[PDB]
Design a protein around this ligand. Sequence first.
Ligand SMILES: CC(C)N(c1cc(-c2ccccc2)sc1C(=O)O)C(=O)[C@H]1CC[C@H](C)CC1
Length: 557
Amino acid sequence: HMSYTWTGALITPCAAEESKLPINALSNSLLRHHNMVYATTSRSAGLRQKKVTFDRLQVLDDHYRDVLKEMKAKASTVKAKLLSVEEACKLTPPHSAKSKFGYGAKDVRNLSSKAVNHIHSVWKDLLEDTVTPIDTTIMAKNEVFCVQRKPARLIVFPDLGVRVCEKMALYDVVSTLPQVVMGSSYGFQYSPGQRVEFLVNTWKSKKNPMGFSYDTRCFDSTVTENDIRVEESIYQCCDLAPEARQAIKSLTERLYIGGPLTNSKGQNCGYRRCRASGVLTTSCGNTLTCYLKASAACRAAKLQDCTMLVNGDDLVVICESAGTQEDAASLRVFTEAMTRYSAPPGDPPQPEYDLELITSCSSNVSVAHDASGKRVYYLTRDPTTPLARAAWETARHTPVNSWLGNIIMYAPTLWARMILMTHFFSILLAQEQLEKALDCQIYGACYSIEPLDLPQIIERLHGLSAFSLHSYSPGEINRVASCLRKLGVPPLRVWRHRARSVRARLLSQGGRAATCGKYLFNWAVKTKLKLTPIPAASRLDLSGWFVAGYSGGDIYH
Ligand SMILES: CC(C)N(c1cc(-c2ccccc2)sc1C(=O)O)C(=O)[C@H]1CC[C@H](C)CC1
């Protein structure tokens, strides 16, 4: 019952890869310790192969089947529509991997007769054949980190024509079903502020709260054929068109359960019998299966008044404490149950009794004060990976701008405001690129975003307090300070100078730019403005944001 079998062929890149941080004239203004930053490449894909390859055993008990029954009952309430080919085409990212059959993502998006003709042929084949394994491409992701080196993560995805077919069959399902099945436990329905609100209210609702995060080792590889068939059984609970049911069955049998792995050179690399990291159902499948196994494990561990929050393979549980020694014992029983269900731990879960100390979705709740001095909870994270990626993005244009996603999602944080906004607005000003729409990713989906809209986006997501936070917590200050020393990032003195410069220039341009200056950088002046609601912010169409997760799923807006 191995997760993968391999032929020995390499996982190959498509283009020249870089691992060392490129340096340009701007690099040192952000970070001096350049040797701390690296990108993963296909060179390390061999180590990853070793890591992801193991035997899965699964022993499924009555808690598991009880939870599944309840999940199916809720799923039976969902009605999902089939997308037209052209609706599905318009969801495709413009820089999505080209088809092997002589068209690309922009062909798809333009509804080119060639792409559309092929997509219809793939659809027909899905309805007619529910057995033949579908080919997938395997590639090493190029992602940037700070040292202490990780091997490249792998992405496995079918041809572009199949990906459009997945949207047709399942886009409505994966967008709608998880919230119905898991209600408030479904993480991707929340903006950062809403996630914080959910966590704080949940923490406060317990008499003696305890929480933990559970890290499954290599979650995709722990996902078994059983798990994937179970996911399919849940999808089929929905009220679907006959054609959708057939396509979902076909895609499950032919793609989701497993299939051959081909490198970018076209050599057979092996065979997958676990979750594909690059299909539409990656996020929704992982979320459901994690929720299923975790809910069942909660019952096995007899955890009292459990509240779960689940985002794909990321899991937080807040429950009633039975004291430290008992909580430790319960978590060990929880871990044992997860292991039996084929979700063994990476790091063993630790009980926490301070909400700020629980890290989930790489983030934690923290506290600061707004302009009136009121305490405000907000979501933050360790800044090391954001700053390392920002450094890469200072020297190189990347298909997804992590800095922009980080500003959007972490707008209220000390580090996003002091460093990311200051640094990148400086660059955008200098290059006259304030009005150029850039791509970023939110919950796996790709969005095109004009930097000049950032104040309205921030006000809408986080509220005006995001432009006024101060008196951050000692833990947060310590972490940010420690990160800046580690990476050799300049001090507040420097960033405050740059922010005032950036601000003054933005005000001069007028219009949306001045609004950027006024709102984003009010923190940098001695005589602060009183920031008022931005009229234009009421007229932003933020539909599609914070509905669902689409990691690996090839979704654009
Ligand atoms: C106290 C004051 C000087 N201060 C401050 C500096 C901190 C800082 C901590 C570590 C490293 C660098 C700066 S924290 C901290 C705060 O108010 O909590 C501030 O005015 C910030 C300045 C940066 C603003 C984005 C947010 C408001």
